[PDB]
């Protein structure tokens, strides 16, 4: 359960990095536009 | 109270997947 | 601590709704563009 | 292990605030 809570925390963090990156790419694409 | 936390975690993850869908639509709108 | 964990969960959820909404507005603005 | 969870929660919140900053920049780029 705690191990499960832990995996989910990390999964949440990983998606968050993915999201940041996606918005960062958008931002860049628009800034050079 | 661990399960209730794990439960919230699940919900939060689902929001993130919904966000990723919004981003996919957006990126297509922007021609990327 | 558990009450603190709880407030943070909810705060996280609230920002997530805000974010969804912001992306939803963007999407709409671009779709009508 | 509660604090370690609370700790992760803090980190996650900070990412969300960074995201909100990226969104502010984006919305200005789009003239909104």
UniProtKB/Swiss-Prot annotation, chains A, C:
Disruption phenotype: Abolishes recruitment of the mediator complex to the upstream activating sequence (UAS) of amino-acid starvation responsive genes. Decreases RNA level of genes involved in amino acid biosynthesis and cofactor biosynthesis during amino acid starvation or methyl methanesulfonate stress. Growth dependent on amino acid supplementation. Sensitive to amino acid starvation. Sensitive to purine starvation. Decreases cellular glycogen levels during glucose starvation. It is found in: Nucleus. Residues 5-26 are annotated as: Leucine-zipper. Phosphorylated by the cyclin-CDK PCL5-PHO85. Induction: Translation is induced by amino acid or purine starvation, or during growth in low or poor carbon sources. Translational repression during nutrient-rich conditions is dependent on four uORFs (upstream open reading frames) present in the 5'-UTR of the mRNA; these promote ribosome dissociation. Translational induction occurs in conditions reducing translation machinery efficiency, leading to ribosomes scanning over the uORFs, and increased translation of the mRNA. The rapid translational induction is followed by transcriptional induction at later time-points, independently of the uORF sequences. It comes from the Eukaryota. Master transcriptional regulator that mediates the response to amino acid starvation. Binds variations of the DNA sequence 5'-ATGA[CG]TCAT-3' in canonical nucleosome-depleted 5'-positioned promoters, and also within coding sequences and 3' non-coding regions. During nutrient starvation (low or poor amino acid, carbon or purine sources), it activates genes required for amino acid biosynthesis and transport, autophagy, cofactor biosynthesis and transport, mitochondrial transport, and additional downstream transcription factors. Belongs to the bZIP family. GCN4 subfamily. Homodimer. Each subunit binds overlapping and non-identical half-sites that flank the central CG base-pair in the pseudo-palindromic motif 5'-ATGA[CG]TCAT-3'. Interacts with the mediator tail; the interaction with GAL11/MED15 is direct. Interacts with the SAGA histone acetyltransferase complex. Interacts with the SWI/SNF chromatin remodeling complex. Residues 89 to 100 and 106 to 125 define the N-terminal activation domain (NTAD) and the central acidic activation domain (CAAD) respectively, which can function independently to promote high-level transcription of the target genes. This is General control transcription factor GCN4. The lineage of its organism: Eukaryota, Fungi, Dikarya, Ascomycota, Saccharomycotina. The chain holds residues 249 to 281 of 281 of the full protein.
């Amino acid at each position: 359960r705690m191990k499960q809570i832990e995996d989910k925390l990390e999964e949440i963090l990983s998606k968050l990095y993915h999201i940041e990156n996606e918005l960062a790419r958008i931002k860049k694409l628009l800034g050079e536009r």
